[PDB]
Each structure stands twice: as structure tokens, then as C-alpha cells.
Design a binder for this molecule. Sequence first.
Ligand SMILES: OC[C@H]1O[C@H](O[C@H]2[C@H](O)[C@@H](O)[C@@H](O[C@H]3[C@H](O)[C@@H](O)[C@@H](O[C@H]4[C@H](O)[C@@H](O)[C@@H](O)O[C@@H]4CO)O[C@@H]3CO)O[C@@H]2CO)[C@H](O)[C@@H](O)[C@@H]1O
Ligand code: CA
Ligand code: CA
Length: 558
Amino acid sequence: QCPKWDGKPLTIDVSKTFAEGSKVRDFYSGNVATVSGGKITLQPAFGSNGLLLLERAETAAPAPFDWHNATVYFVLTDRFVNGNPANDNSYGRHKDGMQEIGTFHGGDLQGLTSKLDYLQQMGVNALWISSPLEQIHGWVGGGTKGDFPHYAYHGYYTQDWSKLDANMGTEADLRRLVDEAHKRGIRILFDVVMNHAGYATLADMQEFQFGSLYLQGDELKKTLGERWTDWKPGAGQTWHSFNDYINFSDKAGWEKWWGKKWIRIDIGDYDNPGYDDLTMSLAFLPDLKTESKEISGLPNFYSHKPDTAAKAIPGYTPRDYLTHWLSQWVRDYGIDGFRVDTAKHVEMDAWQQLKTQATAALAEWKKANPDKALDAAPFWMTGEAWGHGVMQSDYYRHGFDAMINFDYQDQAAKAATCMANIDLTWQQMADKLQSFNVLSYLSSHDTRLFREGGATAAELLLLAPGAVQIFYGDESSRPFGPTGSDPLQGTRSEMNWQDVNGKAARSVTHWQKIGQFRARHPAIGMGKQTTLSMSRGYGFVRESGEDKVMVIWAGQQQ
Ligand SMILES: OC[C@H]1O[C@H](O[C@H]2[C@H](O)[C@@H](O)[C@@H](O[C@H]3[C@H](O)[C@@H](O)[C@@H](O[C@H]4[C@H](O)[C@@H](O)[C@@H](O)O[C@@H]4CO)O[C@@H]3CO)O[C@@H]2CO)[C@H](O)[C@@H](O)[C@@H]1O
Ligand SMILES: [Ca+2]
Ligand SMILES: [Ca+2]
């Protein structure tokens, strides 16, 4: 079912690719061969699976960065490294004492900063982090059954875009991360949401005095207690049960939250969610009125939120505030781009505005910090549109430099046991991505962990045309963790650092060599592909202007 390999050296025909008498390096082994009769002979080093990464021996350093050859490392900051354990319990947040499925584990920006050398060793040149912005303080019911408390550990339940989340760290912590990353040629990307704000939690209701309960006086104190968030589900109750105590009819009480002008939600005297992608409510999340031309003022509950950096601005719509608040971080810190969540659930004008502003903001920060600035490159924005494939969609005309490619995960699944089965996908992609760019992944928090490969995931992802997204732990086969009654939760398991420094050391070393080779050769990401014809194993060359690389896979050893 797959090309085979005797295990002996390979004699490769390089006639058309490399020059006569020129030296060629297998980057994986360090072995150098001279061309004579348009031919070279090399043994794939042990632990290579029969890989040769063939380059001109001239090659000495990484190539100048291009987004079309980018290696993005996507990290859920909470589930990576806990640098500072003091911030793990911000806003009264608690571990669940069970399997920690949907709690803050305590991973933070400081801890992420401590591992930038590790990321650089993999040839990572862009770091995409979960939103570090202030989330909802409390929890909701986790999964269909409500078997775990679900906190905003993933950065998708935003409360205040103008502030950092205390669990992630301080303005100092974020500045150190961005500056240490930029010193290592690693761009910073923020996960950004504009579609929705987080659910109503007991912690936020109590702190910012919005919504209504059915419980009054001392019956309230008996049930919820001093801090309503400390409530545990009782006998014949699930973590969803607390919603039985919340009066979602109270018009005057729920207006004290975002306000009728800010969100569509099926609550009190608010405009109910629409029927189309733009105005519908995803999973009963408050849908932000991004299309509204109505001057909104600030969210009503920001009245009881003195720590906010949000200020009322004349003529400003909810959209204007959101693009403003997100742009501020770019101007202040030099954030190189955004990964945009739920791109299909927000009108295109909103995304264009965000891009215009974020682009101006990055240009400003680079002007004002020319020693720190990597280069004069514009702000990069990529989008999540569910089911988006390899296609120059309308998104590319309204401020997106690349959309996330959903199709590569399942295409690469058909090549898990056999690397050569990807060739038809790579030919298609290398050709179409001469005119535009996408961000392809094997694993995501929304889909599954690509583990059916083993260490072959390294070559499937890192040799793919266009930008590639390593999901944290891809390099270490981070196992799908406990998930309860939500099937996706296990995709966000803790980073398996014990395996990185143990049984998965071989795999990480493999990822490091491929990723470094990718960082040296824009042809991988950008080049036209010529698949070679050999009775001895699978192979291709990629050439893009200056750069030229040949990648040979010998096959299955036995
Ligand atoms: O905070 C604002 C919202 O508050 C109220 O919604 C509650 C619900 O009462 C809870 O049930 C829970 O929602 C869960 C839900 O139990 C679970 O089934 C799933 O929801 C599905 C839904 O069944 C399905 O029909 C479709 O719409 O997809 C949904 C998402 O998969 O997941 C939900 C959350 O994980 O929590 C919320 C928040 O406390 C109130 O009724 C809402 O009107 C309001 O917007
Ligand atoms: Ca921490
Ligand atoms: Ca919407």
C-alpha cells in the first residue's frame, strides 16, 4: 500500500536540479555530496524514516521571512507553561478538583516567553496565542450533561477588549513576550473575537451588578453563598443547574449588562438573535451588533467596572469600539497580526475596518521602535471561515492576507501511513498558491488531534505549500486529554513536556530538522512543484525564484 525501501543508500538523479560539481547537503544528516554525471549517493541518517532534505551546500542561515512560507505555532497559553503560579486564581477562579477539563490550569504569557528558544529550534517564525484579553470571570456548564465547570481558559469568552486577563499576566508580561519573540525572528499573532462576548456567569453578575435572580434575602445566601461563583451543583443537579436560579425575563436587570444597543440575545428587552449567519446567536452567546449604525456608548455594566481602559467616543458604534480596542494592542506592543475567529458571522466591512486600523497601528509602532522592528512588513490578518478550503474567496478582497484551510487535515489523514499519498494534494496546493496564501493545519481545538501519523506529521505539515499551523503538542504527540460530555475539550489537554524531554524526544528532534529546513527555503512554502519519477522512492523539487530544494523519501524500511 506504500513505496518500499531496502535500507541501503540512494543514488539520486539531480541532473536537471543541481549544477555539475556543485556540493549538495542532506540538511537532516549534515552529509555533503559533490555532483558528478548529474548524480549523488547518500544514506538517510537513522531516525529520518528515509528522508533526504537536499539543498545547495551554500545555504548557511534561515531565509528572509515570508508569510507564504510561515511556520505558525498555535498555543492555548493556559494549557502550555505556568511561568507565574500567583495569577492562576484571578477573579476568584478555582480548579474543579476532578479532571480540570474546562478550568484555568495556570499557563500564562511569562511561561510561554520561557519556551521561545524551544519554538525557535523548530523554525517557528510566528506564534499565534489564545486572546490574552480580559475574559468573563466565572464559569458556565460544560458539555451536554454539565459534568464540569467551563471557564474562559481558551480566550473566546471576552468581557473587556481594553484590558489583559489577569490569568495571562501584566502589560509588562505581554511586552517581554513580544520583545523576546521579535529578537528570535518570531512574529506574534492574537486570536481575536468580534462576533460575540462571553456568557453571563454568577461571578460577573455579582461583581458588575447586572441580570436578575429568583432568590432574595437569606434563601439566596443559603443557596449561592457569599461569592455566588463558589456554588457547586448539589444532589440531582448538573453544572447547568445554576441557570434555574437566573431570571432571564427581568428587562430592567439584564439592560444593566451590555445593553440593547450592544448585543442580540434571547433575554429581557434585548433584540432577539436573527436567522442569518451575521445576526444569529452561536450557542446562546451574546451576538455583538457589529452591523449597527446606532451610536451605542459603552456597555452599561462598564459603569461598575472601574479598571476598564474603555472610554466613550463621539459617534462610535459597537464595531468602532471593537476595532479601536483591538488596534490599541498593535499600536502599543507591535503585534504582527490577528487570527480572526468566526469570520463568516460578521459582515466583511467590519474585517476591512479592523485591517485598515491594525495596519496603521503596526506602521506607527514600527516607526516609533525602529531598533525592535523586525522589518517594514504590513500587518497580517488570517480568518476562520468554517469549511474554507484552498480558494481566493471574497475574504481576500476585504483585508485578509490568508484564510485558514480546513481541507488539509483530512487530505493529510489519507497519507498518515504513507507520505507519498499527499503528492496530489501538494501538487494542487503548490500550483494554486502561486497567486494567494492559506494557513493549513493537521490539528485544531475545533476538529481533532492528528495522531494517526506519529512523527510523519512533521513532513506532512512542514513540507505543505503555503503557511502552516503547528497546534501545540503536534511535535510531541500530545494525547487527547479528558473531555467529559464536550467532545472537543480533550483537544485542549496540557502540553506533554514529560514526553518532549522523554519518549517523544525523537519526534521533537524530527520536527526541529524539517522546520529549520523549511525556515531556510521559501521554495517549500512558495515554490512550483515538480514531482520526480524514480523506481527508488518518492520525491519532488520546489523552486521559487532564488531558492531551490529537492525532498526525497526512500519509503517503508520493512
Ligand atoms: O449567558 C447567556 C445565555 O444564558 C442562557 O443559556 C444557558 C443555557 O440555559 C444552558 O443550557 C447552557 O447552554 C448549553 C446547552 O445546555 C447545551 O445543550 C449546548 O447548547 C446547544 C443547544 O442545545 C443546541 O440547540 C444549539 O443551539 O447548539 C448549542 C451549543 O452547542 O451548549 C450550551 C453551552 O455550552 O449555558 C447557557 C449559558 O449560561 C439563556 O437560556 C440564553 O438565552 C442566553 O443567551
Ligand atoms: Ca499562571
Ligand atoms: Ca454576528
